[PDB]
């Protein structure tokens, strides 16, 4: 599914993302916007390293989920990468939380550094009731 902006904001809030390990909801929203355009079915094959990015947060198969086809990969979220292509984003959120428990936090995603870090991200949650 492709979420609408404010629907996603409330969905993320109910899933415990607001302020998770210091990360505001607007930062999560900016991440999802730039990774996938709020699209849970999004995928991107990385031909350079044989890994794939899955779902609304474009989480990568080398470290975080198992797809069986990424050489030498691990599965730190302990999920099939299929779980990151559901309309229901609970598993994707659990995995995103796992990612940010590691030292880099939200900086794990280069798109966040490029498109969200040191930016005014208030617009992503305006009007959404969060």
Experimental determination approach used: X-ray
Given 53, 67, 91, 120, which residue is catalytic?
53
Instruction: Give the closest residue to 122 by CA, choosing from 12, 29, 20.
Output: 29
CA 53 – CA 45 distance, rounded (Å) = 6
| Declared resolution, Å | 1.0
**Number of compact structural domains in the chain:** 1
Q: CA separation (Å) from 32 to 37, 41, 60? A: 6, 12, 14
Tell me if residue 4 is catalytic: no
Tell me, what DSSP letter sits at residue 60? E
Question: Do the beta carbons of residue 92 and residue 58 sit within 8 Å?
Answer: no
CATH value at residue 46: 1.10.530.10
CA 102 – CA 10 distance, rounded (Å) = 25
Residue ranges making up the domain that contains 4? 1-130
Q: CA separation (Å) from 95 to 54, 81, 99? A: 11, 10, 6
Given 4, 7, 18, 35, which residue is catalytic?
35
CA 48 – CA 70 distance, rounded (Å) = 12
Cβ neighbours of residue 37 closer than 8 Å, sequence gap 6 or more: 2
């Amino acid at each position: 599914k492709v979420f609408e902006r404010c629907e996603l904001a409330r969905t993320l809030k109910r899933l415990g993302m607001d302020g998770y390990r210091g990360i505001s909801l607007a930062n999560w929203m900016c991440l999802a916007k730039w990774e996938s355009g709020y699209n849970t079915r999004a995928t991107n094959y990385n031909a350079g390293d044989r890994s794939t990015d899955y779902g609304i947060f474009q989480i990568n198969s080398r470290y975080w989920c198992n797809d069986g086809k990424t050489p030498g990969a691990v599965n730190a979220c302990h999920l099939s990468c299929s779980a990151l292509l559901q309309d229901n984003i609970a598993d994707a959120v659990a995995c995103a939380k796992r990612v940010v428990r590691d030292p880099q936090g939200i900086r794990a995603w280069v798109a966040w550094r490029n498109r969200c870090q040191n930016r005014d991200v208030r617009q992503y949650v305006q009007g959404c009731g969060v």
